[PDB]
From a paper:
[name] is an outer membrane transporter that releases its CdiA toxin to the cell surface. [name] proteins are members of the Omp85 superfamily. Despite low sequence similarity (21% sequence identity), both structures adopt a common fold: an N-terminal α-helix (H1) is inserted into the lumen of the β-barrel and is connected by a ~ 20 residue linker to two periplasmic POTRA domains.
We determined two full-length crystal structures of [name] transporters from [name] (strain ACICU) and E. coli (strain EC93), which will be referred to as CdiBAb and CdiBEc. CdiBAb and CdiBEc structures were built and refined to final resolutions of 2.4 Å and 2.6 Å, respectively. However, H1 is positioned very differently in CdiBAb and CdiBEc: the angle between H1 and the β-barrel is about 10° for CdiBAb, versus 25° for CdiBEc. In addition, H1 sits higher in the barrel pore in CdiBAb, positioning its N-terminus closer to the extracellular surface. In this orientation, H1 interacts with the inner barrel wall using 12 H-bonds and three salt bridges, with no interactions to loop 6, for a total buried surface area of 1263 Å2. In CdiBAb, the DxxG motif accounts for four residues on the 12-residue β1 strand, allowing β1 to form an extended β-sheet with β2, β3, and β16. As a result, the β-barrel is in a fully zipped conformation, stabilized by 10 H-bonds between strands β1 and β16. Extracellular loops 1–2 are short, with loop 2 curved inward and partially blocking the top of the channel. As a comparison, when loop 2 adopts an inward conformation in the CdiBAb X-ray structure, the sidechains point in the direction of H1 and loop 6, and the β-barrel lumen is partially capped. The equilibrium simulations demonstrate that CdiBAb interconverts between the two conformations, while CdiBEc stabilizes only the unfolded conformation.
Residue numbers in the entry: 1 to 197, 199 to 388, 412 to 560
């Protein structure tokens, strides 16, 4: 007997659409604007200079101020570490007033490097009488979080901000907490000195002005893509609920209906996503329900042959920011997933196509800023069971930058996704190319596939003379290789030209494309696509 999932095309397109949807929801979360706060005024190539009166330093130490425990100072030994590490070998040199000023400025830049923007390196110059350079730290702390405007529960502050009153002010934790609050608020954050009767000297007040974002958001989309003969028609209802349980949380709902004339299929899809932050951590869970019907409902033969089936997927996600700055953000994550799928023929179940799978994902993601350019990507390791240690490597890379093109503002965009499988994969685990999600300019009725694969999408958009409009041209490329692939059919090259416009909560995206290079079994026909969305 010949085993066959006649629905494999519709399920591949659903997975690609699911991945695109999850990326768009993650991209909706506002990040902190990039900056370069640790800006060296003077480069510190040479701190020691030849000076009129100087003292020979024989010890560089960090010395507690009044009321400072040495556990408080243990966190700041990197300041003295950096001093002693400097290739000018400060220890044993003759230090006058100008070099001492430079050594202090260097240790303060190092303080700002690690994010302590309200702390200050001071010198206790009395012990220089004995050749001892003794540094001290004015530890700047947080006195009060002040909500000048907007409502926020005490629990929201505790879970969204990884810091509390009385902690040491660090810009990495301020930015993290600010990003968590910007999921549900428009946020204004200011640092001011704390006042006592008329100041608290070592303390700061965090002034927050909050304005809640629209609680309920709707997105209705219709898409009509295909070739000049056949096409697919999609309808999407997206609902975004903002801060429903007052936990800086976001709940997303999506219902999709599709009519694919390429595979004479009808598809419905339900998707729910919940996400809440806990300081540097992030918790998420999602669920997808997918159903299809395939065949001719009223055939000429009088023998109706309908293939239909359902598929469910549940996911639990946990990620933690491990490193961040004004120009980068890095996090590690772990996923737990369970999948279940069954197929039918005229309401009779095909037993050998009943599939339950489960497994876990481990990965790391990074985002990097330089100027107005954004670079972000991830690498993922997956392992899943069946009914057997099937390892899958996944990777992602995206790059965006503005640039001038014939003296008009423009944007360049590159999307790259790659998959490497050491072992044989089942059909659904393969990497597919050709269609709106993998290589544009192809209709997707026939896709190339391999156990290993990668595509790179490239696109340039320029502003139209009309406001809130832009033209774009795109060139995409796909590659498949490894098992489940046959040579000579391993490459796709498509091109797309189109336009996009936004008219007062109405978004249009239309493109016409064609396949440039393809194996003989691929049509290289002309394709069109029209997308309309309404948010309110
Ligand atoms: C440590 C592994 C991280 C994940 C890497 C997966 C991306 C590797 O994809 C390889 C698939 O290549 C298919 C054919 O490639 C031909 C073109 O190659 C030129 C660019 O490498």
């Amino acid at each position: 007997s010949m085993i066959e999932d006649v629905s494999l095309p519709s399920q591949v397109l659903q997975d690609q659409r699911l991945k695109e949807l999850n990326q768009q929801l993650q991209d909706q979360l506002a990040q902190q604007t990039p900056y370069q706060n640790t800006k060296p005024l003077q480069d510190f190539k040479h701190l020691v200079v030849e000076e009129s009166p100087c003292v020979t330093v024989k010890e560089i130490s960090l010395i507690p101020l009044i009321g400072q425990s040495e556990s408080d100072l243990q966190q700041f030994n990197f300041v003295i570490k950096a001093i002693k590490k400097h290739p000018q070998n400060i220890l044993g040199k003759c230090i006058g007033t100008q070099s001492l000023h430079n050594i202090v400025n260097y240790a303060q830049n190092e303080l700002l490097k690690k994010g302590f923007i309200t702390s200050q390196i001071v010198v206790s110059p009395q012990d220089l009488n004995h050749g001892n350079l003794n540094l001290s730290i004015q530890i700047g702390r947080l006195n009060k979080i002040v909500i000048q405007e907007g409502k926020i529960s005490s629990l929201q502050l505790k879970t969204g901000l990884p810091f509390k009153a009385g902690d040491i002010v660090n810009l990495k934790r301020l930015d993290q907490g600010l990003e968590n609050l910007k999921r549900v608020y428009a946020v204004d954050m200011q640092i001011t000195p704390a006042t006592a009767q008329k100041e608290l000297t070592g303390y700061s007040d965090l002034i927050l002005k909050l304005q809640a974002l629209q609680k309920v958001n709707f997105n209705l989309s219709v898409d009509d893509s295909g070739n000049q003969d056949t096409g697919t028609y999609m309808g999407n209802i997206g609902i975004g609920i903002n801060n429903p349980f007052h936990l800086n949380d976001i709940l997303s709902l999506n219902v999709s209906h599709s009519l694919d004339d390429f595979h004479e299929s009808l598809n419905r899809s339900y998707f729910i996503s919940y996400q809440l932050p806990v300081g540097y951590y992030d918790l998420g869970f999602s669920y997808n329900d997918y159903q299809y019907r395939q065949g001719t409902v009223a055939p000429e033969s009088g023998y109706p042959v309908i293939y239909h089936g359902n598929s469910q997927q549940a996911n639990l996600n946990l990620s933690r920011v491990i490193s961040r700055s004004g120009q980068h953000k890095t996090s590690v994550y772990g996923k737990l997933y369970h999948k279940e799928s069954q197929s039918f023929l005229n309401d009779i179940e095909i037993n050998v196509l009943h599939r339950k799978t489960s497994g876990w994902n481990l990965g790391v993601q990074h985002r990097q800023y330089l100027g107005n350019a954004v670079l972000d990507g991830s690498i993922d390791y997956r392992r899943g069971m069946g009914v057997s240690r099937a390892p899958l490597w996944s990777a992602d890379l995206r790059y965006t930058t503005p640039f001038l093109l014939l003296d008009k503002p423009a944007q360049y965009r590159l999307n790259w996704r790659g998959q490497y499988a050491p072992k044989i994969l089942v059909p659904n685990d393969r990497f597919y190319i050709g269609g709106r999600y993998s290589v544009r300019g192809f209709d997707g009725e026939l896709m190339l596939s391999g156990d290993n694969g990668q595509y790179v999408q490239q696109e340039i958009s320029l502003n139209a003379p009309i406001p809130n409009t832009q033209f774009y041209m795109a060139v995409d490329q796909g590659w498949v290789n490894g098992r489940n692939s046959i040579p000579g059919q391993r490459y796709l090259l498509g091109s797309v030209l189109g336009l996009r416009t936004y008219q007062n909560s109405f978004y249009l995206d239309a493109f016409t494309g064609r396949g440039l290079i393809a194996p003989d079994s691929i049509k290289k026909d002309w394709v069109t696509g029209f997308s309309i969305n309404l948010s309110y």
